[PDB]
């Protein structure tokens, strides 16, 4: 099955809809979704983040498309988007927290 059939891919949604869906109080740290860009073209990894000196917020990470490949920073490259999701769901590796649960619809 294609990576777009996956429950964490929300396709074309706004930055507000992303943040409203993720900022449910019933979601743990590390709730995330992959969406299409709105401002900019590349895909976006949208994660919920609890900062002790700020509160509960949403961070947005741009998933740039390698012309060769996907990455958020040029230091960690993945051959597929599912291989990017699977890695960060195990290691923060520069994220505020590791990805734990797929965001509910």
């Amino acid at each position: 099955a294609p990576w777009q059939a996956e429950e964490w891919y929300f396709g074309k949604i706004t930055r507000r809809e992303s943040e409203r869906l993720l900022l449910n109080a019933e979601n743990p740290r590390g709730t995330f979704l992959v969406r299409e860009g709105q401002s900019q073209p590349d895909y976006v990894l949208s994660v919920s983040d609890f900062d002790n000196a700020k509160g509960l917020n949403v961070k947005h990470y741009i998933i740039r498309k390698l012309d060769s490949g996907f990455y958020i920073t040029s230091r960690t490259q993945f051959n597929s988007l599912q291989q990017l999701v699977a890695y960060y769901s195990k290691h923060a590796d520069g994220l505020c927290h590791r990805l734990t649960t797929v965001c509910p619809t």
């Binding site: 930055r15 401002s39 990470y61 920073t73």
Partner: peptide, 7 residues
């Protein structure tokens, strides 16, 4: 204009 995060 919107803010994204750079690792």
């Amino acid at each position: 204009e919107p803010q994204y995060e750079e690792i």
